[PDB]
Short mmCIF file of C-alpha atoms in Angstrom, two decimals:
data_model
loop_
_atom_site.label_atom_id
_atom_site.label_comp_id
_atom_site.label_asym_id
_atom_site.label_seq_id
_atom_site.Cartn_x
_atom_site.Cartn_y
_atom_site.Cartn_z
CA UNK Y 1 -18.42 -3.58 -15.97
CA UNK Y 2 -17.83 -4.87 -19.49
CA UNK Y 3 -14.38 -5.15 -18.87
CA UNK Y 4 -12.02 -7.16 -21.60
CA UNK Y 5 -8.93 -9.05 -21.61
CA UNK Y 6 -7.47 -12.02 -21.97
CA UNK Y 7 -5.35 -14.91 -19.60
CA UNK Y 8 -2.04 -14.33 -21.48
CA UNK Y 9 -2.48 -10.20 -22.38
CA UNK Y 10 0.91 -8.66 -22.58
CA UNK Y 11 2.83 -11.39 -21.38
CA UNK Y 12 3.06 -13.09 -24.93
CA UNK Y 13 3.49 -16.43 -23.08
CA UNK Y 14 1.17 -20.10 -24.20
CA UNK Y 15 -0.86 -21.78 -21.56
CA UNK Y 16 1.62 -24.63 -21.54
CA UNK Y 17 4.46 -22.05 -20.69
CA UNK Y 18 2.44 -21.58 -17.39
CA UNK Y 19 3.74 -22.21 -14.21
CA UNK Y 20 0.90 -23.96 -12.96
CA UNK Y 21 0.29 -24.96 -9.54
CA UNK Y 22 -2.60 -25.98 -7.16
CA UNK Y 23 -4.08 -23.91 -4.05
CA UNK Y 24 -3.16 -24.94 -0.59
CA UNK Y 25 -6.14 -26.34 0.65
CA UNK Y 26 -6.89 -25.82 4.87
CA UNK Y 27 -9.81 -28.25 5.16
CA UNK Y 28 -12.98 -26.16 4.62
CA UNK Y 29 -11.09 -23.58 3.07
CA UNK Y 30 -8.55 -23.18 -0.16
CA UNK Y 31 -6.58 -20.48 -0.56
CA UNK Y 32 -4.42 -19.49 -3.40
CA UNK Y 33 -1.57 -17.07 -2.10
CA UNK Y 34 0.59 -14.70 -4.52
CA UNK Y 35 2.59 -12.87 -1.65
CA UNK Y 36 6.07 -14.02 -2.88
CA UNK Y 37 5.00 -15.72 -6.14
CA UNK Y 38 4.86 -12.50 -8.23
CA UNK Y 39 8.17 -10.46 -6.99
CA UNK Y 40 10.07 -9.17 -10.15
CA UNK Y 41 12.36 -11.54 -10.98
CA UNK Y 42 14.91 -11.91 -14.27
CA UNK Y 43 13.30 -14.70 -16.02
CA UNK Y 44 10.14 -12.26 -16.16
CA UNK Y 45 7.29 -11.68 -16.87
CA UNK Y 46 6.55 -15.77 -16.16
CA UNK Y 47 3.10 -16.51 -15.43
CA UNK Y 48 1.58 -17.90 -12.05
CA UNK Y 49 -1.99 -20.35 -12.38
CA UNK Y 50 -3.40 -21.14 -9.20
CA UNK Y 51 -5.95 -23.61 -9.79
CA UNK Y 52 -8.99 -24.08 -7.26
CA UNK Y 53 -11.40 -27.29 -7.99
CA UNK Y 54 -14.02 -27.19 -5.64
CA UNK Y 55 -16.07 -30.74 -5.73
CA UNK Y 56 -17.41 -30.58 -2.09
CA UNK Y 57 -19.56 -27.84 -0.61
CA UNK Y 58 -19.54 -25.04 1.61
CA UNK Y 59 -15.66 -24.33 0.77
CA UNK Y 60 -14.51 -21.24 1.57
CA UNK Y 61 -12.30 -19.57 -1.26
CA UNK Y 62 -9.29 -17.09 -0.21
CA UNK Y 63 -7.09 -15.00 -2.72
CA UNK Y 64 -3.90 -13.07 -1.37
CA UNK Y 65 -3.05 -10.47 -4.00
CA UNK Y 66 -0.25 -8.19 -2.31
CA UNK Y 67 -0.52 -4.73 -2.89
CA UNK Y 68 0.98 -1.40 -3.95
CA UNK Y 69 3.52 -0.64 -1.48
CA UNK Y 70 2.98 -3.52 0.79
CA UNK Y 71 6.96 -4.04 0.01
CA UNK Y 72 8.82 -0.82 -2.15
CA UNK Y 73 9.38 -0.54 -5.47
CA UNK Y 74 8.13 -4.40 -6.32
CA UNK Y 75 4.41 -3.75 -6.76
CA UNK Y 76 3.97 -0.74 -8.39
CA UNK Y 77 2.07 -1.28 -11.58
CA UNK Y 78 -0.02 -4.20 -10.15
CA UNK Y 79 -3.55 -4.80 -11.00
CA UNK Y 80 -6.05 -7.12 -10.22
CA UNK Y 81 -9.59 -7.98 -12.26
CA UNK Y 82 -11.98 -7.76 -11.57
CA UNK Y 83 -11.65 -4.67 -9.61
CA UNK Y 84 -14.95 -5.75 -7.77
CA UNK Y 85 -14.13 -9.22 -6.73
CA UNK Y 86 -15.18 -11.04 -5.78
CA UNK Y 87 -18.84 -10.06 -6.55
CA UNK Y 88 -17.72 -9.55 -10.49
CA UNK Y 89 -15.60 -12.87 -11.80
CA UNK Y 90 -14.18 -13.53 -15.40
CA UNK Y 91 -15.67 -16.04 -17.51
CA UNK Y 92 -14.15 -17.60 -21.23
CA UNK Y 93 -16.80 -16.35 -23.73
CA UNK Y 94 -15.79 -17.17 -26.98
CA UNK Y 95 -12.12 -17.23 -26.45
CA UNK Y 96 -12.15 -13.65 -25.04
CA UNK Y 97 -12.91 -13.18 -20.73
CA UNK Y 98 -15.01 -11.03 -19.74
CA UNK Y 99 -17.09 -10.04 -16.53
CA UNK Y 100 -19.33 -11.54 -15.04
CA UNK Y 101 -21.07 -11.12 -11.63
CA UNK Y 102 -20.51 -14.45 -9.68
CA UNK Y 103 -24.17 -14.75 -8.11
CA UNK Y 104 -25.67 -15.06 -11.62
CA UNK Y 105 -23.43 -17.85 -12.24
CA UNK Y 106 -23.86 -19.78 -8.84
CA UNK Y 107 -26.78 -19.32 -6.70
CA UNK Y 108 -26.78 -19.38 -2.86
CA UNK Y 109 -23.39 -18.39 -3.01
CA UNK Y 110 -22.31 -15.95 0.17
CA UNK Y 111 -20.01 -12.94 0.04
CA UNK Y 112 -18.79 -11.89 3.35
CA UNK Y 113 -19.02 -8.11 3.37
CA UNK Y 114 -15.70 -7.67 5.52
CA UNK Y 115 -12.87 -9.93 6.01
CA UNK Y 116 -11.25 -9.07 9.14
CA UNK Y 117 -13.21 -6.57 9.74
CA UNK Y 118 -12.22 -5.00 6.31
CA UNK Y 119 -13.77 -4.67 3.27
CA UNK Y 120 -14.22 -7.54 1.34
CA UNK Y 121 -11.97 -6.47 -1.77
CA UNK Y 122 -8.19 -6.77 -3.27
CA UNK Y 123 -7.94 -3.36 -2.63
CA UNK Y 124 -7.34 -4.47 1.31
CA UNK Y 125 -5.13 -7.51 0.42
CA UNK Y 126 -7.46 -10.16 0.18
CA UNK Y 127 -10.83 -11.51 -1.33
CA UNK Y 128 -13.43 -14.56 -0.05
CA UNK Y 129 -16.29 -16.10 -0.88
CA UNK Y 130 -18.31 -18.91 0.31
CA UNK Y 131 -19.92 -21.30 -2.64
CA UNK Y 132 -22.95 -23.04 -1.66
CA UNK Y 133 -24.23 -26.66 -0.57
CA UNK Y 134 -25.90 -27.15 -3.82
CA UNK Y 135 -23.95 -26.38 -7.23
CA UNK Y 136 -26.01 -27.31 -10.50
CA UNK Y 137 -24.01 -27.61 -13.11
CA UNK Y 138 -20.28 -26.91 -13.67
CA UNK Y 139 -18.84 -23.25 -13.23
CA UNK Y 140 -15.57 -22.19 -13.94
CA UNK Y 141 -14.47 -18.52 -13.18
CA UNK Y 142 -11.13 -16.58 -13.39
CA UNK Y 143 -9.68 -13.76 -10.78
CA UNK Y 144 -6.64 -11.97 -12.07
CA UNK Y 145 -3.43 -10.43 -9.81
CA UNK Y 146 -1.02 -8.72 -12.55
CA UNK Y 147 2.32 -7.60 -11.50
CA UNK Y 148 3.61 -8.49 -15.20
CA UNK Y 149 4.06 -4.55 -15.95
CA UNK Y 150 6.00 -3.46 -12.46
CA UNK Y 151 9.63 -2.95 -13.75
CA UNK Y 152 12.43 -2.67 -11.46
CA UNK Y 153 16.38 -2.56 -13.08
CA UNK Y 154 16.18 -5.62 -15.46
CA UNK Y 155 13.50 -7.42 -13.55
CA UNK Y 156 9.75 -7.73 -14.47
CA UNK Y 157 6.96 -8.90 -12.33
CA UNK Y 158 4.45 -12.06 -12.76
CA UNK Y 159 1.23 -12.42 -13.69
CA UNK Y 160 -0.97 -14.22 -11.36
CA UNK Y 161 -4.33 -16.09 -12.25
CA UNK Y 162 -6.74 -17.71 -9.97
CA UNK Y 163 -8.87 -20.31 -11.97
CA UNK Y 164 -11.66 -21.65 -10.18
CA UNK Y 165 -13.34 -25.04 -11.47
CA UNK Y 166 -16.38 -25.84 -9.76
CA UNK Y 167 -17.81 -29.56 -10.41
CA UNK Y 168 -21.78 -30.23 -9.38
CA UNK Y 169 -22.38 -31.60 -5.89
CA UNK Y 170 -25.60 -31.52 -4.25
CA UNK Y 171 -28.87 -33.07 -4.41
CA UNK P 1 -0.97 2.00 22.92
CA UNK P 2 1.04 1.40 20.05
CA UNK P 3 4.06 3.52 20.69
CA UNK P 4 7.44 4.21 18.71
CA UNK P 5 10.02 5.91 20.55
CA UNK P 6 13.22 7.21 18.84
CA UNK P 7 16.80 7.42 20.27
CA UNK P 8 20.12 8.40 19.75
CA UNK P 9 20.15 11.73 18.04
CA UNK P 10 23.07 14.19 18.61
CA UNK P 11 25.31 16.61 17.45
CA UNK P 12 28.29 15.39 14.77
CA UNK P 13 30.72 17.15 12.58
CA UNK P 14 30.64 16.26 8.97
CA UNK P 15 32.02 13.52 8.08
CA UNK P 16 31.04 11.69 11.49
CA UNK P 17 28.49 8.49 12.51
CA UNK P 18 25.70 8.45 14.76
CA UNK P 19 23.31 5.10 15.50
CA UNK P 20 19.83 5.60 15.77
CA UNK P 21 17.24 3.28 17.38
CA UNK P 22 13.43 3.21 17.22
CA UNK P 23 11.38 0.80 20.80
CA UNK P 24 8.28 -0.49 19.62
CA UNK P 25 5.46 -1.73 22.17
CA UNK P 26 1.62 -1.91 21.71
CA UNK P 27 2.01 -3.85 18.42
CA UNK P 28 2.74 -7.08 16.67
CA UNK P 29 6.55 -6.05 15.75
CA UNK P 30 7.32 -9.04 13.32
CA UNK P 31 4.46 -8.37 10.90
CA UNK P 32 5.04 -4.47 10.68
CA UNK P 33 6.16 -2.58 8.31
CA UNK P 34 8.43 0.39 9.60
CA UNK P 35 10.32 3.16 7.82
CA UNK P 36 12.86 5.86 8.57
CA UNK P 37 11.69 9.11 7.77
CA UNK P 38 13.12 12.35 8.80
CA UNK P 39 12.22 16.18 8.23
CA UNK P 40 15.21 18.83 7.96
CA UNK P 41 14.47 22.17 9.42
CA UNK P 42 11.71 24.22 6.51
CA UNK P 43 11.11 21.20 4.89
CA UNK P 44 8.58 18.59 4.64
CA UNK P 45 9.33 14.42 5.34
CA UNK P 46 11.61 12.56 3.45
CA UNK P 47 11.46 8.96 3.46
CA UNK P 48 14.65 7.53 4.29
CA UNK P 49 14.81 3.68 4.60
CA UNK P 50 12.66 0.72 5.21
CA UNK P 51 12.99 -2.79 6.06
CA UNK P 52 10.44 -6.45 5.71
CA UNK P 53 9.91 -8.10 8.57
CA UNK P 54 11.91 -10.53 7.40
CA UNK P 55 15.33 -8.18 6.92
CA UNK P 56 14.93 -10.12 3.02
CA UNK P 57 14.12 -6.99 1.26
CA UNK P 58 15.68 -4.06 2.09
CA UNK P 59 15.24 -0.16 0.62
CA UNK P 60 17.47 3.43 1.16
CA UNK P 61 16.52 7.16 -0.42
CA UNK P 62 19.26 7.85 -2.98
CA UNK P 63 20.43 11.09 -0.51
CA UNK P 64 21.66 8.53 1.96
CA UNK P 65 22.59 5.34 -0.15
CA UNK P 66 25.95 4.00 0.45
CA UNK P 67 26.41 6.16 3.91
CA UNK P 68 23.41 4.81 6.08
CA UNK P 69 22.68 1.14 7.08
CA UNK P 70 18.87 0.00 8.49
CA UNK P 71 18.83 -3.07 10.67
CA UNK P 72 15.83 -4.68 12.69
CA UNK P 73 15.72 -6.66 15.64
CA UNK P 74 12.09 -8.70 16.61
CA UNK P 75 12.81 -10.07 19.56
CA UNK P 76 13.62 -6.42 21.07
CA UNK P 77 10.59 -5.02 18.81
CA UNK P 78 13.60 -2.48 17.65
CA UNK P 79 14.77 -0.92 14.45
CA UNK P 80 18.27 0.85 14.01
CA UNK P 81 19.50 3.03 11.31
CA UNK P 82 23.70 3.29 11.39
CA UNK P 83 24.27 6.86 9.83
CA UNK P 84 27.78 7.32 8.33
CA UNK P 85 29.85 10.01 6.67
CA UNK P 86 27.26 12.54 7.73
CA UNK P 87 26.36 15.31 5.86
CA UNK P 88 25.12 18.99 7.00
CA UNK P 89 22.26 17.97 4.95
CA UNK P 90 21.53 14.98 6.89
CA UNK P 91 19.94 17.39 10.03
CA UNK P 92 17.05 17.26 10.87
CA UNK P 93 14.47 14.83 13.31
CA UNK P 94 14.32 11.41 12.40
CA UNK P 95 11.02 9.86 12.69
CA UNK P 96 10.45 5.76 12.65
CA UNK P 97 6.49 5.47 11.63
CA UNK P 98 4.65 2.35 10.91
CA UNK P 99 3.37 1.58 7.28
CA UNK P 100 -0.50 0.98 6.63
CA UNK P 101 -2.23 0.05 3.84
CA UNK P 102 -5.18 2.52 3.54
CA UNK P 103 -7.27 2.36 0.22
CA UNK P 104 -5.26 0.42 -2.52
CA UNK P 105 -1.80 1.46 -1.31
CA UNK P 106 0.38 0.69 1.75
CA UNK P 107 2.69 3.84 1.14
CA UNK P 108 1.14 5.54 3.97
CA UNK P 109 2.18 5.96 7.93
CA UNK P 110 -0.02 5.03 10.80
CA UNK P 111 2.23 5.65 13.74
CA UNK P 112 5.13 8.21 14.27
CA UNK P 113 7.54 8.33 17.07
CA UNK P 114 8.49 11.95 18.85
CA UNK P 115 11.69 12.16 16.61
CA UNK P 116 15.03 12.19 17.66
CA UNK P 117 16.99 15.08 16.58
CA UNK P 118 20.42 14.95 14.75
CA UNK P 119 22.54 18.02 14.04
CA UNK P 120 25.44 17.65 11.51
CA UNK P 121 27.42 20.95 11.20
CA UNK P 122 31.06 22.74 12.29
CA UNK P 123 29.64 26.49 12.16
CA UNK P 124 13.11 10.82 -11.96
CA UNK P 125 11.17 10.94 -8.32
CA UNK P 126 7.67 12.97 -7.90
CA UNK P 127 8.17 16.54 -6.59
CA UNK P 128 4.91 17.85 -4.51
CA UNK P 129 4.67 21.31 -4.98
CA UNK P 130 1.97 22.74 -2.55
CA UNK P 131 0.42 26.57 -2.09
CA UNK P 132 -0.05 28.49 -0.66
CA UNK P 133 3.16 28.50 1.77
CA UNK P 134 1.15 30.02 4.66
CA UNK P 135 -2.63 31.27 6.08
CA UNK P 136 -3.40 32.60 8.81
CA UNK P 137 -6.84 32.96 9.24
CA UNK P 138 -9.71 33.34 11.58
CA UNK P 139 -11.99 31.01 13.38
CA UNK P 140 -15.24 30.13 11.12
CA UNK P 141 -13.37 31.11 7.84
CA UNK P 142 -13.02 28.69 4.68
CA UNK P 143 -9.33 27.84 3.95
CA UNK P 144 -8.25 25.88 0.92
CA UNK P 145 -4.70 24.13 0.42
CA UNK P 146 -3.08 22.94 -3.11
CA UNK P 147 -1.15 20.63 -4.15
CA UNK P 148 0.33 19.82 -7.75
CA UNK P 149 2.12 16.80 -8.09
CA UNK P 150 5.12 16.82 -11.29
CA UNK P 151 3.56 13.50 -12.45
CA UNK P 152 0.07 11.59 -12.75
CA UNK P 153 -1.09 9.95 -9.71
CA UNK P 154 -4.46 9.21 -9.92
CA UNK P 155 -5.95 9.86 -6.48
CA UNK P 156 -2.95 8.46 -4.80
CA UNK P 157 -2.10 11.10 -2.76
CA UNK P 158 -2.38 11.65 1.27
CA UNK P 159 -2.53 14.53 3.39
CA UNK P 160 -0.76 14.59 7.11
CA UNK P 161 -1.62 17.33 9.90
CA UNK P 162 1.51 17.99 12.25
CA UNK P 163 0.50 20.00 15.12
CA UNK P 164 3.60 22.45 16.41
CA UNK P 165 5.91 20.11 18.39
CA UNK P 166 4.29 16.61 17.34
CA UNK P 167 4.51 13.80 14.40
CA UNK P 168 2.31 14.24 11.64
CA UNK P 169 -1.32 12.99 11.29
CA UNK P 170 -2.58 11.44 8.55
CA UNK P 171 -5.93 12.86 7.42
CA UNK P 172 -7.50 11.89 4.49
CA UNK P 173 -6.12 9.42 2.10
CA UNK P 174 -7.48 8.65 -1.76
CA UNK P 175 -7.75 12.16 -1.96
CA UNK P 176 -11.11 12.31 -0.72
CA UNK P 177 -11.48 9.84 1.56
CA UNK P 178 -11.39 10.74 5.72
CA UNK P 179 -10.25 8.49 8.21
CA UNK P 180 -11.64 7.40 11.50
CA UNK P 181 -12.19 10.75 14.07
CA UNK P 182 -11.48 13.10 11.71
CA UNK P 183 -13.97 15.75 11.48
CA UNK P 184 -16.39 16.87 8.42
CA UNK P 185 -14.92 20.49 7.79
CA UNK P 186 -12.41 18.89 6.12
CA UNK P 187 -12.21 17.78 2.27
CA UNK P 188 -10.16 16.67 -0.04
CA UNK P 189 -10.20 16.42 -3.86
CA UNK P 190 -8.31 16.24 -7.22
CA UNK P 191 -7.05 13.46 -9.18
CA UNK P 192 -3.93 13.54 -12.27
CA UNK P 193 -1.81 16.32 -10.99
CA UNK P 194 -3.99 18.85 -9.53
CA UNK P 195 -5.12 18.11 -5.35
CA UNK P 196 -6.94 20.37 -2.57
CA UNK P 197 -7.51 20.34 0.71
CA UNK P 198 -10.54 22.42 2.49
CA UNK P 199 -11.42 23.34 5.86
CA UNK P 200 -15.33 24.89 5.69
CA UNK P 201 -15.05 26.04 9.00
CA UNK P 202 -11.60 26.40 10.66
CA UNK P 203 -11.57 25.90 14.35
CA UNK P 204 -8.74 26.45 16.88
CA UNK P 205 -7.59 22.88 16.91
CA UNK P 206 -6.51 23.35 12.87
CA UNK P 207 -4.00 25.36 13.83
CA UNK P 208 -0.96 23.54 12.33
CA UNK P 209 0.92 22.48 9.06
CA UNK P 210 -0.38 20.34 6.51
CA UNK P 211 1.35 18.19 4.54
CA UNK P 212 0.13 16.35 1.31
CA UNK P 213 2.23 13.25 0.11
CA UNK P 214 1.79 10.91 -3.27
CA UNK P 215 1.39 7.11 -2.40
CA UNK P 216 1.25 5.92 -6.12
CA UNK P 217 4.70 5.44 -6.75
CA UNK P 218 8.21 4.45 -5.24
CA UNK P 219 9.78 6.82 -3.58
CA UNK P 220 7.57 7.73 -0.85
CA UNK P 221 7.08 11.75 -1.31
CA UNK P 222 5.71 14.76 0.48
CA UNK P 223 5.20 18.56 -0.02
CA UNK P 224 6.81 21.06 1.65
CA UNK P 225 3.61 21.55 3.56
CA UNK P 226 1.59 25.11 4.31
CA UNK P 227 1.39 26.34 7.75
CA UNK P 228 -2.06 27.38 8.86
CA UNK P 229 -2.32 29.99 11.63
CA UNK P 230 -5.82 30.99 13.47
CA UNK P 231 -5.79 34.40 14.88
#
């Protein structure tokens, strides 16, 4: 781990330049999906916050993060951080993220070890996690899907950023 | 029994059209992925064309841009690809095979179709380099493949088996990594340029040509394979 960066990066772009948006909530489970939000466009690189506030338990959290190749040409350079999400989460230290691992930070919490009978990763499309009936004290935790340095003719991908704000509930 | 079947293929002068069609059955046709790839005689695959689901987003090789138009329909779980102002390098078999993601990339084939021949005659992008250009070999040796790819790939890259007659196979993917049924005589390794492929112990069944292929990095790519013979 030990992995650095930083919400804006490259993009050279203020949080109130964001595109910010909430996640589409299914009941028990929110989801925050970056299939079409990220495709190069001309106005790139813009920026993409997906915002997840959890104040109720035993939500389920899905992440769509497309990958390389999933469509030609549009996904090429894309990264997503952590790499081992969603066991390893970003937290703002300082003013500077950095990783953390997520079961430290909120305990009980359940990782699925496959998700649709794959692995559990963003290397297979998607990530999820499970937070627990009890949360102490107020969490907040970044994921990361970066398509900001995919170029195709004149057109730059998005940067997409999964911010997860979880309030205490529980006894 | 996910099946692709290919149709149309023919002979045409230069300078002529041809239609080709891929039937799909055994599979959820609207949420695939599916891609045009064909294989002229002594060389290996070249991707062609592909098409979303959706017919949004739509992508041809640079060989057959401007000449060759890809079309899907769901309903009929069938793909077309309308060749015009063919070429004499245009022949070949033209494969339709289903796109998987495997690992961290999706530039990689599940599912090929028998191929449907097409003769044309009257009378910047990675290049895969692989060696050696033929073994043969007997059964219980140790055989290793290369393969050197003209830019940095990480462990990107793929190699297919394609048994005399049949569609290739893909075998390992990540560079290292085996997928499901394959057997443990065979390795892979590498990563940047430099690949290989080993065999410990070659059995009958190996007899074939293998084919290694870069899934970093539009365009799709493959080498020009290395036949492997068992005497």
């Amino acid at each position: 781990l030990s992995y650095e960066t930083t919400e804006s990066g490259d993009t050279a772009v203020s949080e109130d330049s964001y595109d910010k948006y909430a996640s589409q909530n299914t009941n028990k489970e929110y989801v925050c999906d970056f299939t079409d939000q990220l495709k190069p466009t001309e106005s790139g690189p813009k920026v993409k916050k997906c915002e997840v506030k959890v104040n109720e338990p035993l939500i389920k959290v899905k992440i769509i993060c497309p990958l390389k190749g999933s469509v030609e040409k549009l996904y090429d350079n894309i990264e997503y951080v952590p790499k081992k999400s969603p066991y390893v989460v970003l937290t703002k230290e300082e003013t500077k993220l950095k990783e953390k691992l997520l079961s430290k930070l909120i305990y009980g919490l359940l990782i699925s070890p496959t998700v649709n009978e794959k692995e559990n990763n963003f290397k297979e499309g998607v990530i999820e996690f499970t937070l627990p009936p009890v949360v102490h004290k107020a969490t907040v935790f970044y994921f990361i899907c970066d398509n900001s340095k995919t170029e195709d003719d004149n057109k730059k991908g998005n940067r997409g950023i999964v911010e997860v704000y979880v309030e205490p509930y529980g006894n | 029994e996910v099946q692709l079947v290919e149709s149309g293929g023919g002979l045409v002068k230069p300078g002529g059209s041809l239609r080709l069609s891929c039937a799909a059955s055994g599979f959820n046709f609207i949420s695939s992925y599916i891609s045009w790839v064909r294989q002229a005689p002594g060389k290996g695959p070249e991707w062609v064309s592909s098409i979303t689901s959706t017919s949004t987003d739509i992508h041809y090789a640079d060989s057959v841009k401007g000449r060759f138009t890809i079309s899907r329909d769901n309903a009929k779980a069938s793909l077309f690809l309308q060749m015009n102002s063919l070429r004499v390098e245009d022949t070949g078999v033209y494969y339709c095979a289903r796109r998987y993601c495997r690992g961290g990339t999706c530039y990689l084939f599940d599912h090929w179709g028998q191929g449907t021949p097409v003769i044309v005659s009257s009378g910047s992008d990675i290049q895969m380099t692989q060696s050696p250009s033929s073994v043969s070999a007997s059964v219980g040796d140790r055989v290793t493949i290369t393969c050197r790819a003209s830019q940095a790939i990480s462990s990107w890259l793929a190699w297919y088996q394609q048994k005399p007659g049949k569609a290739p196979k893909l075998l390992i993917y990540g560079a290292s990594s085996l997928e499901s049924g394959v057997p443990s005589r065979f390795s892979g390794s590498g990563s940047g340029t430099d690949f290989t492929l080993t065999i410990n112990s070659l059995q009958p069944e190996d007899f074939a040509t293998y084919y290694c292929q870069q899934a970093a990095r539009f365009p799709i790519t493959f080498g020009q394979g290395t036949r492997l013979e068992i005497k």
